[PDB]
Amino acid sequence: TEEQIAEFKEAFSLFDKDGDGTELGTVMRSLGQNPTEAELQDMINEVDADGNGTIDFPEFLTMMARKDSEEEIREAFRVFDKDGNGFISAAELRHVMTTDEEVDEMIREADIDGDGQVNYEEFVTMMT
Amino acid sequence: GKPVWAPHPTDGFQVGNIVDIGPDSLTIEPLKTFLALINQVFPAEEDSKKDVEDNCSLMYLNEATLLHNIKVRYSKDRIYTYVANILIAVNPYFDIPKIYSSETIKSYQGKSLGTMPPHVFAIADKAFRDMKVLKLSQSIIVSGESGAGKTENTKFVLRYLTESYGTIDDRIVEANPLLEAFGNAKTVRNNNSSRFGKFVEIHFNEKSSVVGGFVSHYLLEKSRICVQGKEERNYHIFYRLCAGASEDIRERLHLSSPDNFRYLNRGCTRYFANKETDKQILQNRKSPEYLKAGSLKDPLLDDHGDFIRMCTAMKKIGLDDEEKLDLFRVVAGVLHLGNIDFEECNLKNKSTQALEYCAELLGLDQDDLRVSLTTRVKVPLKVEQANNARDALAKTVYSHLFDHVVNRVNQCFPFETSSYFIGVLDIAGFEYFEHNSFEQFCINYCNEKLQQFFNERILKEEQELYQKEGLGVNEVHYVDNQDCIDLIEARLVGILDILDEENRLPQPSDQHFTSAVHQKHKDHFRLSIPRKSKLAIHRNIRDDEGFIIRHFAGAVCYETTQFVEKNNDALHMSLESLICESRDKFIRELFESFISVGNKFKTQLNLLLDKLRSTGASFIRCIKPNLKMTSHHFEGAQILSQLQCSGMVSVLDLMQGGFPSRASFHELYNMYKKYMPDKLARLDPRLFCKALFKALGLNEIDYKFGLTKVFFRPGKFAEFDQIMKSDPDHLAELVKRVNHWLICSRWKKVQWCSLSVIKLKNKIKYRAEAVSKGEELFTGVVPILVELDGDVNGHKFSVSGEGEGDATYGKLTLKFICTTGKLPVPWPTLVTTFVQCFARYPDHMRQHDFFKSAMPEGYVQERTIFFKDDGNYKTRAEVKFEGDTLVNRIELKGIDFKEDGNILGHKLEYNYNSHNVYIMADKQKNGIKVNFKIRHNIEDGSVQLADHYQQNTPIGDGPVLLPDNHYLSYQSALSKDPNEKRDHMVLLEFVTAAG
Numbered sequence A: 001t002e003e004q005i006a007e008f009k010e011a012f013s014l015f016d017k018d019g020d021g022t023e024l025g026t027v028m029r030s031l032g033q034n035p036t037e038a039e040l041q042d043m044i045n046e047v048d049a050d051g052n053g054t055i056d057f058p059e060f061l062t063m064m065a066r067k068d069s070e071e072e073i074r075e076a077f078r079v080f081d082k083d084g085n086g087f088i089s090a091a092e093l094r095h096v097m098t099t100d101e102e103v104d105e106m107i108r109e110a111d112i113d114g115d116g117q118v119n120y121e122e123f124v125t126m127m128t
Numbered sequence B: 001g002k003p004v005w006a007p008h009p010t011d012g013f014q015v016g017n018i019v020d021i022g023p024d025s026l027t028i029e030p031l032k033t034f035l036a037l038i039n040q041v042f043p044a045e046e047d048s049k050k051d052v053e054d055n056c057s058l059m060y061l062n063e064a065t066l067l068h069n070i071k072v073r074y075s076k077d078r079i080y081t082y083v084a085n086i087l088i089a090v091n092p093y094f095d096i097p098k099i100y101s102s103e104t105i106k107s108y109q110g111k112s113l114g115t116m117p118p119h120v121f122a123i124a125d126k127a128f129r130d131m132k133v134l135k136l137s138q139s140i141i142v143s144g145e146s147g148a149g150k151t152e153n154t155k156f157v158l159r160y161l162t163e164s165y166g167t168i169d170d171r172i173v174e175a176n177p178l179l180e181a182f183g184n185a186k187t188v189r190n191n192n193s194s195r196f197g198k199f200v201e202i203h204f205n206e207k208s209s210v211v212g213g214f215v216s217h218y219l220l221e222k223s224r225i226c227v228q229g230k231e232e233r234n235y236h237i238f239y240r241l242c243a244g245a246s247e248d249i250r251e252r253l254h255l256s257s258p259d260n261f262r263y264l265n266r267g268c269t270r271y272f273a274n275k276e277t278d279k280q281i282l283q284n285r286k287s288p289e290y291l292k293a294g295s296l297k298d299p300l301l302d303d304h305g306d307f308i309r310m311c312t313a314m315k316k317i318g319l320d321d322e323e324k325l326d327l328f329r330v331v332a333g334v335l336h337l338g339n340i341d342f343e344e345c346n347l348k349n350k351s352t353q354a355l356e357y358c359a360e361l362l363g364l365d366q367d368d369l370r371v372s373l374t375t376r377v378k379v380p381l382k383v384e385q386a387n388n389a390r391d392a393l394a395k396t397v398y399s400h401l402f403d404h405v406v407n408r409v410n411q412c413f414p415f416e417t418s419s420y421f422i423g424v425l426d427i428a429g430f431e432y433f434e435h436n437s438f439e440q441f442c443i444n445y446c447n448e449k450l451q452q453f454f455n456e457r458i459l460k461e462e463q464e465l466y467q468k469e470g471l472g473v474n475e476v477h478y479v480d481n482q483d484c485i486d487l488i489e490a491r492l493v494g495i496l497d498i499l500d501e502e503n504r505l506p507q508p509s510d511q512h513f514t515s516a517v518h519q520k521h522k523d524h525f526r527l528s529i530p531r532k533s534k535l536a537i538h539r540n541i542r543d544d545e546g547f548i549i550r551h552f553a554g555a556v557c558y559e560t561t562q563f564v565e566k567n568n569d570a571l572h573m574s575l576e577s578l579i580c581e582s583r584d585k586f587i588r589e590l591f592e593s594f595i596s597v598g599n600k601f602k603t604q605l606n607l608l609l610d611k612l613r614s615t616g617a618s619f620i621r622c623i624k625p626n627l628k629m630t631s632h633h634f635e636g637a638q639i640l641s642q643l644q645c646s647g648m649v650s651v652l653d654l655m656q657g658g659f660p661s662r663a664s665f666h667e668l669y670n671m672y673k674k675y676m677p678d679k680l681a682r683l684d685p686r687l688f689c690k691a692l693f694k695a696l697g698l699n700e701i702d703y704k705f706g707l708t709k710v711f712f713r714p715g716k717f718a719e720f721d722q723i724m725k726s727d728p729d730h731l732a733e734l735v736k737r738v739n740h741w742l743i744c745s746r747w748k749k750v751q752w753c754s755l756s757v758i759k760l761k762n763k764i765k766y767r768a769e770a771v772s773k774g775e776e777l778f779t780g781v782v783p784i785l786v787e788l789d790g791d792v793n794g795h796k797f798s799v800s801g802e803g804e805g806d807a808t809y810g811k812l813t814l815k816f817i818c819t820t821g822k823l824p825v826p827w828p829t830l831v832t833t834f835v836q837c838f839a840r841y842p843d844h845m846r847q848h849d850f851f852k853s854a855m856p857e858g859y860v861q862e863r864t865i866f867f868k869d870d871g872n873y874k875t876r877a878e879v880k881f882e883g884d885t886l887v888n889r890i891e892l893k894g895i896d897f898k899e900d901g902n903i904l905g906h907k908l909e910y911n912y913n914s915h916n917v918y919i920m921a922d923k924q925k926n927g928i929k930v931n932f933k934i935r936h937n938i939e940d941g942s943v944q945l946a947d948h949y950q951q952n953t954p955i956g957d958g959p960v961l962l963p964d965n966h967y968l969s970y971q972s973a974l975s976k977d978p979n980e981k982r983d984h985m986v987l988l989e990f991v992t993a994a995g
Ligand SMILES: Nc1ncnc2c1ncn2[C@@H]1O[C@H](COP(=O)(O)OP(=O)(O)O)[C@@H](O)[C@H]1O
Pocket: B091, B092, B093, B094, B095, B096, B144, B145, B146, B147, B148, B149, B150, B151, B152, B153, B190, B191, B192, B193, B194, B299, B300, B428, B429, B622
């Protein structure tokens, strides 16, 4: 969809910390994902058409495509859960983020029911 | 090759198709085939029925699309159209129903430009909002040549503002019948022509409520009082008085049908009337011309009907019957003055009655009147000089009467103090006739100044703003008219100053003045001698009998006869004394050497310019549709030049990349900051603004950040107005709305980024899976089947192959049978053609194995093989799994082979050398590229060279491995099956990959 690409583009800037338009490892590790260095050079090698190794946004999306998505969203929630109870706390969301008051304002604005924490059934609503 | 606009002599533009193109010109075939230059040909709107309210909405912005858009709208009685915040108004020449109603007035209040259809009311409302919000006075300038609709639109504006923001408030409106009675007259161009310029100020208090107003008047036409053309009239009052006055008033003032008065009877003596209003006028009021030819026709003017409305207006604004009667008494006095003839000088016997009536109505002694018109002071006057005395008295009396009327009008709506004003400018419209005099010169000069102000404000300063702010808006050039203004008002050398000099020297001369003008501007772009005129109807005018000024609105030829006399405002002492000492109090109060009319005018107009420069300015550009005062007659060519001369074509051009709305970034941000939670406040100001513009509609192309001001594109006035709105709740609601949006972003950003990592990680597993699967297909021994069809110089052959591959050892064991008889080529030339997926890639090389990674779906191998000094092969091979066996289908074409060469003459030895093959990635095609030379041994001990060019691309769209540059080592052994009866080859090959 035309919306989903724009959402990915905003996410792409969290990969493009330098702001130039070009790292994957740095954020992939920091997002708390084990997979080492060997596989990254191999994965980039499918979209880099000019050989430059320059990472461009149109490359990013195609590089992500496969020939199951519902479980990916559920796995994304598990990236927020440090322990894995079913709720995300202010201290949990602060971990993925790296002011504390701003994190509280961020937590409260998602909490639809009123528990002071964010569960999956409401984590999806925010995303779409 | 879509239809286009190209010039038309009377429509301005016509539709046609380009047929042939030259360097600077082309041919157009109308929808008769004709020549047009490239730069007078324009792209057309694809829908010829559609119209847009703002010309900036057009797909193509040019003078032709502009003309057509206005044409279509006028066809539907949509007389108003925008170019950004400027209004174009085409004179309908009929009353469009309800379009100016009080109900319509209310509907425009507080509404942003664009949210209602283009209207004079929206411009007036825009001026009000600007005044109220920016705390800055405002001026509405309504331009246009004669009869274009300036006075009518001026009235619509004044009516809007006073009805909308009044609460005695209708006096500014009710005043016009009075001013028009004394300042308006019939012309060939306009039945209700204004013969004076006016600036009507509506003053406001702190609460932005109307507290009163002020009318400034400029240069009333003086000569019209005494004489006019056969098709023109004196001021309406005379005819309104004669048509409508009671029999009582007629007797007291000794009035009769207009033909009886020298000051009326050289002009048109007919009344404006219809069937119904003709009956309401008595017979003793109607001239022989009226009786012979009927009334004059107009939808707005009606002499008898206007008299009543005037009397009603006077009563409505505070004028008592005493003052009404005083006014009428002076009017008739001036009339009777003109009926005084002279003979040799002395008053003629017949004009005795005229002297009595005039002296009585003007409160004068007969003997005193007779002497003042007849003698100079202390010596007697010639017949023609007495005429000059008579007419000069009439011109001063009527002029002072007019001054008194506007002054009396200003006293209806006075104000102690005001905060701001909205002023509406209504000058006399650009005009020209068969004979042009000082009247046209002064009027057209004033028109030049207005156009210069439009140029100054809309074309010069706008682009200076874009540049000072670094916007990079394409410059629009245009011809400026300041030179034309310089020619007229410059110190010492200007026409007005040269004219004043002429009045000053001992024996003044029109021709000495005219000569001086020409001599002092020898080669000037704006001045020429009458001999260079386009028309031949004015070619016999000598150099010192006139000049041409090339006005912005067109060249006008002036006859300079009577310029000197007309430039002098002064009245001689004996005439001045006579009238100042009238026994009539009213006439004494009318009056409270050389006085320059030109320089008094220039001073007044520059003081007006000072006013205008200090205000925010809005423009309404009025257009005359035709020359015959008819409705529904759009004359394209005539309207086109008005659009060009007005500068609207230049403006439309600028708006292709221009920005009509702008605000100070610092000011805009700070007014929202006051409501920002202290968190959002930390956010980069520019980012907040971007989020705010998003929240109120705008896309990124709709606005631009300059160095200090943020600019907004055409057609976005409502959005702009919402952004700028100062209301606390509105600023709080918006801040809340963007605050929410930023939290929704920050969430979605880290949310989608988490999904991004999940997908990246998933893709990695998806690559490995696929490559493992490919690799696990080749763990053990794998059966092969090969099929080739070949054509070599017309020799068609087929071969079938079978055997097995062992990728662990890199071993190929294959037997090929030619099923079609003898092979037309030597077997060795087919060895490289006769499943690289069976190559040995050792431990640390497995990452470089494209061939296995494409499996089971496989790949296409394409080769060109060049046999040096001989022909070439082209091969296409399709290699993939088919169950547990690897299959390969090949097509081969050979051409250009020498029939007695090594290939077709079978001179190659049945053996094979070892070779290295250099593999590299073909990044663009997602496969590999290969280059190698095979050396084949010739019987006599020489070598046949075979140059190979190879490309492999995968069949499926699944993931494959793209390798680092590496090479494959081949060993090949050729042998024969001792029991095989058919033509054949047994091939044994070993292949290892290496660094
Ligand atoms: N909006 C309008 N509706 C109806 N009639 C109009 C309109 N504008 C102009 N006219 C007609 O055109 C004539 C000339 O317009 P006017 O405003 O007097 O010209 P100028 O621009 O010289 O002041 C008017 O007498 C009136 O009949």
